[PDB]
C-alpha cells in the first residue's frame, strides 16, 4: 500500500504544512470548501456555511489525527487503533449524520488545499505520498465509524 519513498515524502510534507499549526491552515481551507460545495455536511459538522470559524476547528483538529498517523504509515498496528476509535466517535456525534462517503472525496480535495501552505514545495510525490497515506489514515477511521 505504501513505500519507503512515499512514507518519507509524507513526513517531509507534514513537517512543513503542520510545522507549528500542525495542519491548522489545511482543514480550515479544505473543510470550508467541502461545506460550501456540500450543503449536506454543514449541519453535520456544525456550521451554517463556508464563512464559519468552526470549520478551522474541525479541519484543524482532524489534521492532527493525520499527523499522529504520519508517524506510523508502515506500522498499521497502533496508529490505526486510535483512528479506528475516531470512527466509533463519529457513530454518535451531535449530528448523527456522518458517512465514509465524504471521507475519500474530502480526503482528495484536502491534498489540493495542503499546497496552500507549502505552495511550490508540494510536488507530485507530496500529493501522491499523502494520497496513499491518507487512504490508510481515513480508511482506518471508517472501521469504528458507522458502529
Ligand atoms: C467527511 C466526513 C466527516 C464528517 C461528516 C465528520 C464530521 C465531524 C463532526 C460533526 C465532528 C464534531 C463537530 C461537532 O461538534 O459537530 C467531527 C469531529 C472530528 N472529526 Fe470528523 N468528520 C468527517 C471525517 C473525518 C475524518 C476523515 C477525520 C480524520 C482524518 C476526522 C476527524 C475528526 C476529529 C479528530 C474530530 C474531533 C472530535 C473528536 O475526535 O473528539 N473526521 N467530525
From Swiss-Prot:
Globin domain: which residues?
1-146
> Which CDD domains does the entry mention?
Mb-like
- Keywords on record: Heme, Iron, Metal-binding, Oxygen transport, Transport
Lineage at the top is: Eukaryota, Metazoa, Spiralia, Lophotrochozoa, Annelida
Binding, heme b: 90
Q: Does the keyword Hydrolase apply?
A: no
Full protein name = Globin, monomeric component M-IV
Pfam families of this UniProt entry?
A: Globin
Assembly and partners are described as: Monomer.
The GO terms this record gives for MF are: heme binding; metal ion binding; oxygen binding; oxygen carrier activity
Q: Hey, which family's this protein in? A: Belongs to the globin family.
Amino acid at each position: 500500500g505504501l513505500s519507503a519513498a512515499q512514507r518519507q515524502v509524507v513526513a517531509s510534507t507534514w513537517k512543513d504544512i503542520a510545522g507549528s499549526d500542525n495542519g491548522a491552515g489545511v482543514g480550515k481551507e479544505c473543510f470550508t470548501k467541502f461545506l460550501s460545495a456540500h450543503h449536506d455536511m454543514a449541519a453535520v459538522f456544525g456550521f451554517s456555511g463556508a464563512s464559519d470559524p468552526g470549520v478551522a476547528d474541525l479541519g484543524a483538529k482532524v489534521l492532527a489525527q493525520i499527523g499522529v498517523a504520519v508517524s506510523h504509515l508502515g506500522d498499521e498496528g497502533k496508529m490505526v487503533a486510535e483512528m479506528k476509535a475516531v470512527g466509533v466517535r463519529h457513530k454518535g456525534y451531535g449530528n448523527k449524520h456522518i458517512k465514509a462517503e465524504y471521507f475519500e472525496p474530502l480526503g482528495a480535495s484536502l491534498l489540493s488545499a495542503m499546497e496552500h501552505r507549502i505552495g511550490g514545495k508540494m510536488n507530485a510525490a507530496a500529493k501522491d505520498a499523502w494520497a496513499a497515506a491518507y487512504a490508510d489514515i481515513s480508511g482506518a477511521l471508517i472501521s469504528g465509524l458507522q458502529s
